[PDB]
Amino acid sequence: SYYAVAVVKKGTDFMIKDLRGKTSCHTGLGRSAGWNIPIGTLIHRGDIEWEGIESGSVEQAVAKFFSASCVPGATTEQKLCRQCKGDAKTKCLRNAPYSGYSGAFQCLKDGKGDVAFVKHTTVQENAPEEKDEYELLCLDGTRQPVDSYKTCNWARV
């Protein structure tokens, strides 16, 4: 079991309703915590306007919402690769430097995204001496500490 969480830095003050126009770090296209849960959550609050697939791409809809992102595996929207770290031709592949739970978290740490969609063990696993520099974005419009995932997660997977 795990809990999908949205990690942000303590220096910022935006909440979930204020995500439009921010930059985002994702584990990869089509993965659970990094894409299916957050994007679906945003589509259902009505923040990302997608009503259905007509030629319709979710990628297009997301690229319109975030100003830029890193979404390893993205196929059609270059904006979704803009924040990725790496070489000109592989930075956006599904096994790129910012891919995976560790890579999405590094993208936030490096300041290449304002939010990283990862799981509840991610900050602890990758920056245990820096946990206090991060917090989580809750569905109810607040922020809570990294260890408070049980009451501040977007879904239990």
Ligand X SMILES: O=C(O)CN(CC(=O)O)CC(=O)O
Q: Which residues form the interface with Fe ion (CB under 5 A)? A: 31-32
Binds 157: which of ligand X, Fe ion, none (CB < 5-8 Å by kind): ligand X
- Residue number, nearest CB to ligand X: 31
β-sheet bridge partners, residue 3: 156
- Identify which of residues 36 and 60 has a Cβ nearer to Fe ion in the complex: 36
Spatial CA neighbour of 69 closest among 91, 45, 42: 91
Name the minimum Å distance from CB 132 to ligand X. 26
Find all residues with CB under 8 Å of 56, minimum gap 6, and list them. Answer: 50
Q: Which amino acid is at 40?
A: G
Contact at 8 Å (CB) between 139 and 6? no
d(CA 57, CA 61): 7
- Identify which of residues 32 and 67 has a Cβ nearer to Fe ion in the complex: 32
Q: Which residues bind ligand X (CB under 6 A)?
A: 31-33, 157
- Identify which of residues 66 and 117 has a Cβ nearer to ligand X in the complex: 117
- Identify which of residues 70 and 143 has a Cβ nearer to Fe ion in the complex: 70
Beta strand pairing status for 143-145 and 23-26?
A: unpaired
Cα separation values, 129 from 25, 132, 134, Å: 21, 8, 11
Binds 109: which of Fe ion, ligand X, none (CB < 5-8 Å by kind): none
Name the minimum Å distance from CB 72 to ligand X. 11
Binds 63: which of Fe ion, ligand X, none (CB < 5-8 Å by kind): none
Name the minimum Å distance from CB 58 to ligand X. 15
